[model samples]
Target: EQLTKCEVFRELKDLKGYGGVSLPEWVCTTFHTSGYDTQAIVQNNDSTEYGLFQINNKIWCKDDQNPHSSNICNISCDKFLDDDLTDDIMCVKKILDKVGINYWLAHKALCSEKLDQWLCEK
Candidate 1:
């Protein structure tokens, strides 16, 4: 669907550049796994993950359900669910700057190498 579109992958690559991060494969992998649905949400223990990147409520974003969250991204968790990916990319850049790529376990395990096919075919 939309997530697998070549245009989506291209835009994601462009956004990663704007963020000054160099993890296109990681980004693609995140989208591939967590964001087949733009409004997707997931709960793990007491914390929730929001939106395409599955940003965690424990540290990156704020939500009523996670009142004690640090909100390092300084954005509402719900904002990440929006179809517009600008905020999500910005938040992801902050995360990359602060925490490095290991923040997403999937990146470490699945996208560290041999990423030639992650991008949608043009």
Candidate 2:
């Protein structure tokens, strides 16, 4: 889903200011290891317009809708060890996309911490 988002970002660069967000190599590798099955995670069986990172159903009800996207729930999933496995992988990608993989390495959190210098808004 992240790669898809990156592709979308690349395509819509003129409109979305996507180039401001930098995706690192390690982040891409992490996503590859975590699994990239977006369709399975976000299939509501009703809505054509999917949520951010394509999360579906009430799986997103627990988190704040601050960004108006499914990303918040995904991030929650990434933090909790007992979070749904299906959502966890998507959550990992969301954080990596948000903070960059290097930040996790610098913070030594094994993909934790959604804030870092490299992730500053452009």
Candidate 3:
């Protein structure tokens, strides 16, 4: 499922996307959850969550069923489940812009006050 280790820390372009989240916050969010697993898939009774950050099938991407879900990203669910990061990232940032970091609401419980030490010092 995951290509990277639990502690994988690579430099990505700084985000202006998540207003409620810092880069380190995102690191903590992903690390403690999906661990940046590009192929991760979590299916629910009604919908599926896909990709690195567990994007939703109905709201974020689409499968081949008539789940009557709006495709917010307007991309295939398969696209999100791919190993490529760029397109997935592009969609995720757009999601952040719309939903804000709070969409990953459970991350708040784990993150607490700050995640300044969650990422490597550089």
Candidate 4:
């Protein structure tokens, strides 16, 4: 399910950004990365990216099909697609701490530009 604008803000408003990445930028990241689709998943070159905010098997979650994963989140990739976002958000916070907001390519390539466009200009 795609989260509504208010819902996104509701979840993020009280949350602090990491590594100099602003909360507003995170709002934009959610829109551009998974478009707030909580169950979203995509297959990359050699691993799978899962969840709403692009948690990947490269160094995050464990992917049964990917043998080289480090599974930094110490979680199975499947848990990301569930209805509750608590764990997903926690995992993302961990990611933001180490990798910064650039972990989501959309944040760097597209969402970073014209900040008002994705959230306010709509």
Model 4, 2-113: lDDT tens digits are: 7876577667654545566766777788878888888899895787888778788888998777756888888888898876777887888888778777778887887667
- TM-score to true structure, per model: 0.82, 0.24, 0.79, 0.82
* Cα error, candidate 4, residue 79 (Å): 1.2
lDDT per model, in order?
A: 0.74, 0.35, 0.68, 0.77
Clashing pairs in 3: none
Best by the lDDT measure = 4
- Residues 1-122 of candidate 2 have per-residue lDDT tens digits of 33342442232233222223334332332343333333233223443212223332233323333334454544442233332334444543455465543422332353234424212133
The lDDT-based order of candidates, best leading, equals: 4, 1, 3, 2
Candidate 1 error regions (>4 Å): 17-24, 120-122
Supply the global lDDT for candidate 4: 0.77
Best by TM-score: 4
Better structure of 2 and 3 per TM-score: 3
Q: What's the lDDT for residue 54 in model 2?
A: 33
In terms of lDDT, the poorest run of 10 residues in model 1 is 14-23
Quick one: ranking by TM-score, best first? 4, 1, 3, 2
The TM-score obtained by model 1 is 0.82
Pairs that collide in candidate 4 are none
Q: For model 2, state the Cα shift of residue 87 in Å.
A: 1.2
* TM-score head-to-head 1 vs 4, winner: 4
- Least lDDT summed over 10 consecutive residues: which range in candidate 4? 9-18
